[PDB]
Amino acid sequence: MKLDDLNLFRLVVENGSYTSTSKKTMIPVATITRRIQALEDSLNLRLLNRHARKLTLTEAGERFYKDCSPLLERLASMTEEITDECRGASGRIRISAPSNLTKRMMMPMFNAFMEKYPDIHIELMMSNQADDLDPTEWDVIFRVGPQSSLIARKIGEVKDILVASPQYLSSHPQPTHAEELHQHQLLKGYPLLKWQLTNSQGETVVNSDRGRFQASALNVVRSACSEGLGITLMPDVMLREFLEDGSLVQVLSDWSSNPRDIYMLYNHKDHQPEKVRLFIDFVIGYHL
Amino acid sequence: MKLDDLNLFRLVVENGSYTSTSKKTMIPVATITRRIQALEDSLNLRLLNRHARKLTLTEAGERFYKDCSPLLERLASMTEEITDECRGASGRIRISAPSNLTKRMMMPMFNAFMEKYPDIHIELMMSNQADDLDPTEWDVIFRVGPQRDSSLIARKIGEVKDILVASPQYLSSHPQPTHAEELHQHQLLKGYPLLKWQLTNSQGETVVNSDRGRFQASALNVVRSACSEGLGITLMPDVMLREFLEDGSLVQVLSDWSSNPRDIYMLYNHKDHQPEKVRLFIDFVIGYHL
Amino acid sequence: MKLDDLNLFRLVVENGSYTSTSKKTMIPVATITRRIQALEDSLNLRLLNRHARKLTLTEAGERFYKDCSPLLERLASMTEEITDECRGASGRIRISAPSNLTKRMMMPMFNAFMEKYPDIHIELMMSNQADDLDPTEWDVIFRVGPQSSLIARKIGEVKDILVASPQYLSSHPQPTHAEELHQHQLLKGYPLLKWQLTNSQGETVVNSDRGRFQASALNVVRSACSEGLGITLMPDVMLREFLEDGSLVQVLSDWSSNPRDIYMLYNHKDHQPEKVRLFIDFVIGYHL
Amino acid sequence: MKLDDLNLFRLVVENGSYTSTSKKTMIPVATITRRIQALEDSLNLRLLNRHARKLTLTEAGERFYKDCSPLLERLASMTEEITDECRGASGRIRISAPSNLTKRMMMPMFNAFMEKYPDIHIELMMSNQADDLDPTEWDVIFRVGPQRDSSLIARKIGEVKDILVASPQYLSSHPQPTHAEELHQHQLLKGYPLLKWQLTNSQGETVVNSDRGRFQASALNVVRSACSEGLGITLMPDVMLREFLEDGSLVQVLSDWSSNPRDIYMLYNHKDHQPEKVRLFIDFVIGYHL
């Protein structure tokens, strides 16, 4: 038996005619009939009759209507209320974001978001890797590189550049070719351990030297680099202020690393609760 | 928003997967997927997550399941409470039966019943023995072998004799074995539930063959088919084979080596609690030869 | 430390020169040097020296070479042997296929395959549904409709048609319009329970009548149909012989159901073991 | 076929995932994926299945792992056996340290060490306290809080005082609490491992706050940042904060309410079994102020 046929029947009873029931729902009358006669067959029990107008009920039809009517009514209004509450929901959202980049690249966005919406709470996990995240455990994932059933929107891009302190360069003549990096003390932070560099002429150079200093995070490498301990490869977005205040200097600028794209992964925004729709809209707004 | 889709959503949560749900309702997975999508589109709310094989509820899905379920359960009870009432020789009856034997062994009988009772409709679900059913979900269960005994009248309506056969083409090239032990040298073709062959000769010698087989399948009909094509020896109910035994196209081998006969039972709730439509069916089976 | 640098070193020792080692491998000498000097640095221990030719060893280099050389040799030949054995592997393959169609549509293919290759064993599971299969548990999946990381090749197509026995039609005037099906006894088997039919003019008709007979498999429905119990919708591939011997008759031929495609799902054939490559090739051959 | 890719395949199997493997080796997942592909392409054999999160071996993968592993293990031992040998003030040392405090508290010291010893190279892995390490995999472990005690010399090298702070902007609009109980009325910002605030005043009153917070994060630096933006009150090590306490940009609140001081330890294997490169490091830390 089809619950929607059974509700179509109720709309019929409450109204008092098939004419009345079909006009409110936008469902032709024989269809109703087809469906009420369908409902009769499934229940193995008859119901309404037509003279010209439709009407009445059977002894068991009244008892049945009186019985199921109240439950069906409630359902219709319960579902409507739950819908508004879930679509309008505030509270906690769960976000994953790349460990290295979050502090300087994401936090100003997250901070502005939170200031704007005091009733939305963020739970933020920072990871070096997004590939093993159970997507069902997160409202939004921010990752470096592409992944796969989630909607993926590119929101940004990082350019990795080579830097050293003026004290370092002052005692170690700057290299002008990336092969020369083998002659230098190198400082390397995950995920930029194997450097792949290309110049204007299409020359490619690979550097997988171990490194004087090798760390699982780039912020401590940048620190080592500021103390004059060698050359590092680092997202421009992690370096802005040091470049600007002049305590770190770009070398090998003709030698570029593959640009890396930043993605936001989420589920169909329109079917998300309010707290998540607002966040997605905000990020998009922030990045356009 | 369709209440049936909402109801379907509830059932999906209870079963824990689309395939599991598809099995119980006979709604194809693709249609289940489509209907859940339609539900979500009507609410503008994602209700379920599907990662891997794992189905989990969103917060919204969680709220819909918890809150709406009780009312959907009451309505279901309510409408079943009606269709459980006897309208004489009419209504639907729900039957469970084994995958292998039903077509050949039971359909003649089921057909004759439907012919006699045109207003009684049959919903027939086939499955391998395997998992046990909730008996309250069925009007009559046909099974092979003894049941749990639990809460059910059982009646033996038949039995099958499983025998070994090969095609003449196969035997032409692989001389008949004369002892069941020799089956290890032959190409075996096995279908569930006859995977582990337990054979006894008239001297009382018994052989157990659990070779994997050249061909193993989850049902016996495709195996008979491989056997007819001369691909080896299979063990198979006599009933599934008389056609082919009569034409020289399958021949019995190791005739002195027999397998345990297997009983066919009909199980049902006592007839005192049984509507007329089911009583007529039960009495029909009982009076039917084969 | 890089095992391939360490093996490159062995090729150097065994040969007696960088000249000798680079020519056999197609790897420039400074690269070797770059890599052997890389290997030295990672081990924090020196090795070979060049006059003009390269040669010799250190006290610890001999002990180390004598120690690691035999293990590296074995590895090179072990991996080669395992490779041949796995690429050449016979034995059991696991296949899933649609319950309804397998007997008449797949078995002649499977039978011919098995006759051709006696050392390949098939384990065959037939299911009504493929959507919940752990793809890692199957060598090949055959399914109706599309799915998603497996390679999917369409191998066939079924056309579902409407039939009844001559005895049935003889007492129930044949319908010429699909709406008329409501007036008939219908027999319905999974997955063809809700019939969706379209005619030449674009008229669509839907039938979700319960059915005099409704079953989880189509073969028993076809049987019911042969006994004159009503009209069914059924794959042409399940009906061929009954159509041909005339015990089942097509009605409503202007009214077509959506054709359903048969897919074979598998992993990159070239990286599969012999027993699976042969099967995939066979099916493709069988279907072209 | 690259033996390093084969070795990488072995490590993937041992760890059970690419992410897990990526963590231990500092090889990005994408590069691990690429290198396994290259291995498979060189053998023309699929070695691994990747469904869901679940990684499983093909038959071929199974044969490669079982057969080749022992030799790959012996080679690894063998080459580590060498680099374990003391070459004086040179070689690589492997250090584990906490995510939060390392940058500010330990890098000055690590930098000064590298400056003094240019031929000693540092591999530094940061992680939250969380899981326990295999100590045999590290030369020196820096941690917060007491260890398992197991098989390791421990030395206290510092401690942190965690204090409550907010921005003047925040306090302007949300009057300072005067009792820790009032924190329930405020916007809280929490970073692991300071999620459950356990505060005691000088009268001995103690408050436990386990509110989820307006902002919860897996590290403290992003939380200080939210705090500077005026988004609420956080609990945070003094050391991570003196810069901002000096400019009026963060102010301490509830100064009479204190949290348990947390110790910073260096752990290492006894120096008798320690090469020179590690001994120099250990002695350097010991002599270093902060």
PDB file of N, CA and C in Angstrom, chain C residues 1-7 42-45 64 67-68 71-72 74-75 78-79 82-83 85-87 89 92 133-136 267 270-273 275, chain D residues 1-7 37 40-41 43-46 49-51 54 56 59-60 63-64 67-68 71-72 74-75 78-79 82-83 85 87 90-91:
ATOM      1  N   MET C   1      68.261   6.606   3.106  1.00  0.00           N
ATOM      2  CA  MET C   1      69.043   6.003   2.028  1.00  0.00           C
ATOM      3  C   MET C   1      68.178   5.342   0.951  1.00  0.00           C
ATOM      4  N   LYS C   2      68.576   5.541  -0.301  1.00  0.00           N
ATOM      5  CA  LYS C   2      67.827   5.062  -1.448  1.00  0.00           C
ATOM      6  C   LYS C   2      68.360   3.721  -1.945  1.00  0.00           C
ATOM      7  N   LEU C   3      67.519   2.697  -1.850  1.00  0.00           N
ATOM      8  CA  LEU C   3      67.884   1.354  -2.269  1.00  0.00           C
ATOM      9  C   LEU C   3      68.355   1.296  -3.711  1.00  0.00           C
ATOM     10  N   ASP C   4      67.836   2.180  -4.552  1.00  0.00           N
ATOM     11  CA  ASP C   4      68.227   2.218  -5.959  1.00  0.00           C
ATOM     12  C   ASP C   4      69.594   2.876  -6.158  1.00  0.00           C
ATOM     13  N   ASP C   5      69.927   3.828  -5.288  1.00  0.00           N
ATOM     14  CA  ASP C   5      71.272   4.368  -5.268  1.00  0.00           C
ATOM     15  C   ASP C   5      72.216   3.244  -4.842  1.00  0.00           C
ATOM     16  N   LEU C   6      71.839   2.537  -3.779  1.00  0.00           N
ATOM     17  CA  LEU C   6      72.624   1.410  -3.286  1.00  0.00           C
ATOM     18  C   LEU C   6      72.810   0.281  -4.313  1.00  0.00           C
ATOM     19  N   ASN C   7      71.827   0.080  -5.184  1.00  0.00           N
ATOM     20  CA  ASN C   7      71.957  -0.918  -6.243  1.00  0.00           C
ATOM     21  C   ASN C   7      72.785  -0.374  -7.400  1.00  0.00           C
ATOM     22  N   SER C  42      74.233   9.950   2.554  1.00  0.00           N
ATOM     23  CA  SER C  42      73.139   9.394   3.349  1.00  0.00           C
ATOM     24  C   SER C  42      73.666   8.368   4.352  1.00  0.00           C
ATOM     25  N   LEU C  43      74.661   7.592   3.920  1.00  0.00           N
ATOM     26  CA  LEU C  43      75.317   6.610   4.777  1.00  0.00           C
ATOM     27  C   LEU C  43      76.343   7.288   5.680  1.00  0.00           C
ATOM     28  N   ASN C  44      76.693   8.527   5.345  1.00  0.00           N
ATOM     29  CA  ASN C  44      77.742   9.247   6.059  1.00  0.00           C
ATOM     30  C   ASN C  44      79.019   8.413   6.032  1.00  0.00           C
ATOM     31  N   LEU C  45      79.428   8.044   4.819  1.00  0.00           N
ATOM     32  CA  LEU C  45      80.555   7.145   4.602  1.00  0.00           C
ATOM     33  C   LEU C  45      80.944   7.152   3.125  1.00  0.00           C
ATOM     34  N   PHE C  64      80.780  -3.656   3.393  1.00  0.00           N
ATOM     35  CA  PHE C  64      79.407  -3.290   3.090  1.00  0.00           C
ATOM     36  C   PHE C  64      78.964  -3.890   1.757  1.00  0.00           C
ATOM     37  N   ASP C  67      78.527  -7.455   1.972  1.00  0.00           N
ATOM     38  CA  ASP C  67      77.349  -7.752   2.780  1.00  0.00           C
ATOM     39  C   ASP C  67      76.027  -7.552   2.028  1.00  0.00           C
ATOM     40  N   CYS C  68      75.877  -6.406   1.370  1.00  0.00           N
ATOM     41  CA  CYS C  68      74.615  -6.068   0.722  1.00  0.00           C
ATOM     42  C   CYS C  68      74.502  -6.625  -0.696  1.00  0.00           C
ATOM     43  N   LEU C  71      72.304  -9.816  -1.204  1.00  0.00           N
ATOM     44  CA  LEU C  71      70.887  -9.581  -0.982  1.00  0.00           C
ATOM     45  C   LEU C  71      70.273  -8.845  -2.163  1.00  0.00           C
ATOM     46  N   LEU C  72      71.011  -7.893  -2.721  1.00  0.00           N
ATOM     47  CA  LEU C  72      70.512  -7.088  -3.832  1.00  0.00           C
ATOM     48  C   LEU C  72      70.384  -7.910  -5.100  1.00  0.00           C
ATOM     49  N   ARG C  74      69.851 -11.266  -5.322  1.00  0.00           N
ATOM     50  CA  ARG C  74      68.691 -12.115  -5.149  1.00  0.00           C
ATOM     51  C   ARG C  74      67.405 -11.343  -5.435  1.00  0.00           C
ATOM     52  N   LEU C  75      67.256 -10.185  -4.807  1.00  0.00           N
ATOM     53  CA  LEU C  75      66.098  -9.328  -5.039  1.00  0.00           C
ATOM     54  C   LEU C  75      65.805  -9.141  -6.522  1.00  0.00           C
ATOM     55  N   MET C  78      64.640 -12.515  -7.799  1.00  0.00           N
ATOM     56  CA  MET C  78      63.383 -12.867  -7.153  1.00  0.00           C
ATOM     57  C   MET C  78      62.225 -12.083  -7.764  1.00  0.00           C
ATOM     58  N   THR C  79      62.378 -10.759  -7.872  1.00  0.00           N
ATOM     59  CA  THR C  79      61.299  -9.921  -8.407  1.00  0.00           C
ATOM     60  C   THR C  79      60.940 -10.324  -9.831  1.00  0.00           C
ATOM     61  N   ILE C  82      58.866 -13.726  -9.615  1.00  0.00           N
ATOM     62  CA  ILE C  82      57.541 -13.462  -9.099  1.00  0.00           C
ATOM     63  C   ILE C  82      56.702 -12.807 -10.200  1.00  0.00           C
ATOM     64  N   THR C  83      57.324 -11.886 -10.943  1.00  0.00           N
ATOM     65  CA  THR C  83      56.614 -11.165 -11.992  1.00  0.00           C
ATOM     66  C   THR C  83      56.059 -12.133 -13.042  1.00  0.00           C
ATOM     67  N   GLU C  85      55.554 -15.356 -12.738  1.00  0.00           N
ATOM     68  CA  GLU C  85      54.570 -16.230 -12.129  1.00  0.00           C
ATOM     69  C   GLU C  85      53.227 -15.526 -11.963  1.00  0.00           C
ATOM     70  N   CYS C  86      53.238 -14.267 -11.545  1.00  0.00           N
ATOM     71  CA  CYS C  86      51.969 -13.553 -11.372  1.00  0.00           C
ATOM     72  C   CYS C  86      51.333 -13.144 -12.694  1.00  0.00           C
ATOM     73  N   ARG C  87      52.140 -12.743 -13.664  1.00  0.00           N
ATOM     74  CA  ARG C  87      51.580 -12.363 -14.945  1.00  0.00           C
ATOM     75  C   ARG C  87      51.026 -13.592 -15.647  1.00  0.00           C
ATOM     76  N   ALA C  89      49.797 -16.319 -14.193  1.00  0.00           N
ATOM     77  CA  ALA C  89      49.006 -17.136 -13.275  1.00  0.00           C
ATOM     78  C   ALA C  89      47.702 -17.687 -13.877  1.00  0.00           C
ATOM     79  N   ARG C  92      41.794 -19.831 -10.358  1.00  0.00           N
ATOM     80  CA  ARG C  92      40.441 -19.392 -10.083  1.00  0.00           C
ATOM     81  C   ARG C  92      40.189 -17.928 -10.387  1.00  0.00           C
ATOM     82  N   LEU C 133      28.456  -4.491  -4.106  1.00  0.00           N
ATOM     83  CA  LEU C 133      29.599  -5.391  -4.221  1.00  0.00           C
ATOM     84  C   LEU C 133      30.885  -4.639  -3.869  1.00  0.00           C
ATOM     85  N   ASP C 134      31.674  -5.216  -2.974  1.00  0.00           N
ATOM     86  CA  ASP C 134      33.036  -4.750  -2.757  1.00  0.00           C
ATOM     87  C   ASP C 134      33.825  -5.166  -3.998  1.00  0.00           C
ATOM     88  N   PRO C 135      34.152  -4.200  -4.864  1.00  0.00           N
ATOM     89  CA  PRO C 135      34.834  -4.491  -6.126  1.00  0.00           C
ATOM     90  C   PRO C 135      36.170  -5.218  -5.919  1.00  0.00           C
ATOM     91  N   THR C 136      36.794  -5.052  -4.758  1.00  0.00           N
ATOM     92  CA  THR C 136      38.043  -5.752  -4.472  1.00  0.00           C
ATOM     93  C   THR C 136      37.864  -7.263  -4.286  1.00  0.00           C
ATOM     94  N   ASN C 267      39.318  -4.334 -13.865  1.00  0.00           N
ATOM     95  CA  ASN C 267      40.485  -3.476 -13.742  1.00  0.00           C
ATOM     96  C   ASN C 267      41.408  -3.612 -14.952  1.00  0.00           C
ATOM     97  N   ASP C 270      45.693  -5.213 -18.963  1.00  0.00           N
ATOM     98  CA  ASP C 270      47.130  -5.463 -19.064  1.00  0.00           C
ATOM     99  C   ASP C 270      47.855  -5.697 -17.723  1.00  0.00           C
ATOM    100  N   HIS C 271      47.261  -5.249 -16.615  1.00  0.00           N
ATOM    101  CA  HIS C 271      47.891  -5.413 -15.299  1.00  0.00           C
ATOM    102  C   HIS C 271      47.266  -6.547 -14.507  1.00  0.00           C
ATOM    103  N   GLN C 272      46.386  -7.277 -15.168  1.00  0.00           N
ATOM    104  CA  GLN C 272      45.720  -8.431 -14.581  1.00  0.00           C
ATOM    105  C   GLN C 272      46.534  -9.685 -14.845  1.00  0.00           C
ATOM    106  N   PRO C 273      46.387 -10.719 -14.006  1.00  0.00           N
ATOM    107  CA  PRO C 273      47.041 -12.002 -14.281  1.00  0.00           C
ATOM    108  C   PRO C 273      46.432 -12.696 -15.500  1.00  0.00           C
ATOM    109  N   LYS C 275      44.920 -15.485 -16.214  1.00  0.00           N
ATOM    110  CA  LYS C 275      43.588 -16.084 -16.158  1.00  0.00           C
ATOM    111  C   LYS C 275      42.487 -15.039 -16.377  1.00  0.00           C
TER     112      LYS C 275
ATOM    113  N   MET D   1      62.119  -1.264 -13.002  1.00  0.00           N
ATOM    114  CA  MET D   1      61.549  -1.378 -11.663  1.00  0.00           C
ATOM    115  C   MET D   1      62.489  -0.801 -10.609  1.00  0.00           C
ATOM    116  N   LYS D   2      61.998   0.177  -9.860  1.00  0.00           N
ATOM    117  CA  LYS D   2      62.775   0.796  -8.802  1.00  0.00           C
ATOM    118  C   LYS D   2      62.592   0.087  -7.465  1.00  0.00           C
ATOM    119  N   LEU D   3      63.697  -0.364  -6.888  1.00  0.00           N
ATOM    120  CA  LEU D   3      63.662  -1.048  -5.603  1.00  0.00           C
ATOM    121  C   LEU D   3      63.077  -0.145  -4.511  1.00  0.00           C
ATOM    122  N   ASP D   4      63.262   1.167  -4.641  1.00  0.00           N
ATOM    123  CA  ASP D   4      62.693   2.099  -3.667  1.00  0.00           C
ATOM    124  C   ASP D   4      61.171   2.139  -3.743  1.00  0.00           C
ATOM    125  N   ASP D   5      60.623   1.984  -4.946  1.00  0.00           N
ATOM    126  CA  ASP D   5      59.163   1.938  -5.092  1.00  0.00           C
ATOM    127  C   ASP D   5      58.615   0.634  -4.510  1.00  0.00           C
ATOM    128  N   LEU D   6      59.334  -0.460  -4.776  1.00  0.00           N
ATOM    129  CA  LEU D   6      59.022  -1.766  -4.199  1.00  0.00           C
ATOM    130  C   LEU D   6      59.083  -1.668  -2.678  1.00  0.00           C
ATOM    131  N   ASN D   7      60.126  -1.017  -2.175  1.00  0.00           N
ATOM    132  CA  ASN D   7      60.251  -0.791  -0.741  1.00  0.00           C
ATOM    133  C   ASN D   7      59.130   0.061  -0.207  1.00  0.00           C
ATOM    134  N   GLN D  37      51.943   3.590  -8.705  1.00  0.00           N
ATOM    135  CA  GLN D  37      51.546   3.445 -10.094  1.00  0.00           C
ATOM    136  C   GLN D  37      52.735   3.076 -10.967  1.00  0.00           C
ATOM    137  N   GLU D  40      53.708  -0.552 -10.465  1.00  0.00           N
ATOM    138  CA  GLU D  40      52.754  -1.402 -11.173  1.00  0.00           C
ATOM    139  C   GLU D  40      52.963  -1.380 -12.690  1.00  0.00           C
ATOM    140  N   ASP D  41      53.149  -0.186 -13.250  1.00  0.00           N
ATOM    141  CA  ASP D  41      53.472  -0.008 -14.669  1.00  0.00           C
ATOM    142  C   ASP D  41      54.754  -0.737 -15.061  1.00  0.00           C
ATOM    143  N   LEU D  43      55.944  -3.477 -13.649  1.00  0.00           N
ATOM    144  CA  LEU D  43      55.712  -4.922 -13.540  1.00  0.00           C
ATOM    145  C   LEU D  43      54.578  -5.378 -14.448  1.00  0.00           C
ATOM    146  N   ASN D  44      53.833  -4.417 -14.988  1.00  0.00           N
ATOM    147  CA  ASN D  44      52.568  -4.714 -15.645  1.00  0.00           C
ATOM    148  C   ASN D  44      51.698  -5.573 -14.757  1.00  0.00           C
ATOM    149  N   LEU D  45      51.655  -5.227 -13.478  1.00  0.00           N
ATOM    150  CA  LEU D  45      50.870  -5.961 -12.496  1.00  0.00           C
ATOM    151  C   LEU D  45      50.228  -5.015 -11.507  1.00  0.00           C
ATOM    152  N   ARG D  46      48.941  -5.199 -11.266  1.00  0.00           N
ATOM    153  CA  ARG D  46      48.254  -4.481 -10.206  1.00  0.00           C
ATOM    154  C   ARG D  46      48.630  -5.147  -8.890  1.00  0.00           C
ATOM    155  N   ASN D  49      44.634  -2.932  -4.176  1.00  0.00           N
ATOM    156  CA  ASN D  49      43.314  -2.383  -4.396  1.00  0.00           C
ATOM    157  C   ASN D  49      43.047  -1.234  -3.427  1.00  0.00           C
ATOM    158  N   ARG D  50      42.414  -0.185  -3.936  1.00  0.00           N
ATOM    159  CA  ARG D  50      42.000   0.933  -3.104  1.00  0.00           C
ATOM    160  C   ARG D  50      40.500   1.134  -3.235  1.00  0.00           C
ATOM    161  N   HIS D  51      39.756   0.602  -2.275  1.00  0.00           N
ATOM    162  CA  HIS D  51      38.330   0.857  -2.194  1.00  0.00           C
ATOM    163  C   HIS D  51      38.059   1.558  -0.866  1.00  0.00           C
ATOM    164  N   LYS D  54      39.832   1.532   2.580  1.00  0.00           N
ATOM    165  CA  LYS D  54      40.419   0.204   2.727  1.00  0.00           C
ATOM    166  C   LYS D  54      41.433  -0.118   1.631  1.00  0.00           C
ATOM    167  N   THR D  56      43.855  -3.051   0.162  1.00  0.00           N
ATOM    168  CA  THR D  56      44.067  -4.491   0.190  1.00  0.00           C
ATOM    169  C   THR D  56      44.930  -4.953  -0.978  1.00  0.00           C
ATOM    170  N   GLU D  59      46.449 -10.700  -5.515  1.00  0.00           N
ATOM    171  CA  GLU D  59      47.222 -11.929  -5.342  1.00  0.00           C
ATOM    172  C   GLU D  59      48.688 -11.632  -5.617  1.00  0.00           C
ATOM    173  N   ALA D  60      48.945 -10.913  -6.699  1.00  0.00           N
ATOM    174  CA  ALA D  60      50.294 -10.485  -7.048  1.00  0.00           C
ATOM    175  C   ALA D  60      50.902  -9.639  -5.926  1.00  0.00           C
ATOM    176  N   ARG D  63      51.916 -11.868  -3.093  1.00  0.00           N
ATOM    177  CA  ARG D  63      53.137 -12.601  -3.389  1.00  0.00           C
ATOM    178  C   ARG D  63      54.386 -11.704  -3.251  1.00  0.00           C
ATOM    179  N   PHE D  64      54.310 -10.476  -3.755  1.00  0.00           N
ATOM    180  CA  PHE D  64      55.440  -9.550  -3.645  1.00  0.00           C
ATOM    181  C   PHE D  64      55.752  -9.186  -2.191  1.00  0.00           C
ATOM    182  N   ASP D  67      57.131 -12.449  -0.164  1.00  0.00           N
ATOM    183  CA  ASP D  67      58.415 -12.947  -0.661  1.00  0.00           C
ATOM    184  C   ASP D  67      59.567 -11.952  -0.560  1.00  0.00           C
ATOM    185  N   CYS D  68      59.333 -10.720  -1.000  1.00  0.00           N
ATOM    186  CA  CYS D  68      60.382  -9.710  -1.049  1.00  0.00           C
ATOM    187  C   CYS D  68      60.661  -9.020   0.279  1.00  0.00           C
ATOM    188  N   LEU D  71      64.021  -9.765   2.503  1.00  0.00           N
ATOM    189  CA  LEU D  71      65.215  -9.179   1.908  1.00  0.00           C
ATOM    190  C   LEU D  71      65.251  -7.657   2.055  1.00  0.00           C
ATOM    191  N   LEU D  72      64.099  -7.008   1.919  1.00  0.00           N
ATOM    192  CA  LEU D  72      64.047  -5.562   2.069  1.00  0.00           C
ATOM    193  C   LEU D  72      64.294  -5.167   3.525  1.00  0.00           C
ATOM    194  N   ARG D  74      66.161  -6.983   5.721  1.00  0.00           N
ATOM    195  CA  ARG D  74      67.580  -7.230   5.966  1.00  0.00           C
ATOM    196  C   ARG D  74      68.441  -6.087   5.437  1.00  0.00           C
ATOM    197  N   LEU D  75      68.156  -5.655   4.212  1.00  0.00           N
ATOM    198  CA  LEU D  75      68.877  -4.538   3.618  1.00  0.00           C
ATOM    199  C   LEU D  75      68.727  -3.282   4.461  1.00  0.00           C
ATOM    200  N   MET D  78      70.679  -3.670   7.630  1.00  0.00           N
ATOM    201  CA  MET D  78      72.068  -3.570   7.208  1.00  0.00           C
ATOM    202  C   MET D  78      72.580  -2.147   7.029  1.00  0.00           C
ATOM    203  N   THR D  79      71.823  -1.325   6.316  1.00  0.00           N
ATOM    204  CA  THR D  79      72.274   0.027   6.029  1.00  0.00           C
ATOM    205  C   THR D  79      72.097   0.960   7.227  1.00  0.00           C
ATOM    206  N   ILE D  82      74.968   0.571   9.607  1.00  0.00           N
ATOM    207  CA  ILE D  82      76.108   1.398   9.232  1.00  0.00           C
ATOM    208  C   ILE D  82      75.947   2.831   9.737  1.00  0.00           C
ATOM    209  N   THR D  83      74.835   3.464   9.382  1.00  0.00           N
ATOM    210  CA  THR D  83      74.631   4.869   9.721  1.00  0.00           C
ATOM    211  C   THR D  83      74.412   5.065  11.219  1.00  0.00           C
ATOM    212  N   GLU D  85      76.615   3.907  13.187  1.00  0.00           N
ATOM    213  CA  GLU D  85      77.999   3.991  13.628  1.00  0.00           C
ATOM    214  C   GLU D  85      78.496   5.434  13.687  1.00  0.00           C
ATOM    215  N   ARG D  87      80.486   8.737  13.407  1.00  0.00           N
ATOM    216  CA  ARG D  87      81.489   9.390  12.565  1.00  0.00           C
ATOM    217  C   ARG D  87      81.906  10.726  13.174  1.00  0.00           C
ATOM    218  N   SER D  90      79.029  14.537  13.030  1.00  0.00           N
ATOM    219  CA  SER D  90      78.402  14.572  11.722  1.00  0.00           C
ATOM    220  C   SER D  90      77.377  13.457  11.646  1.00  0.00           C
ATOM    221  N   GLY D  91      76.486  13.558  10.666  1.00  0.00           N
ATOM    222  CA  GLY D  91      75.377  12.637  10.533  1.00  0.00           C
ATOM    223  C   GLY D  91      74.029  13.301  10.777  1.00  0.00           C
TER     224      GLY D  91
END
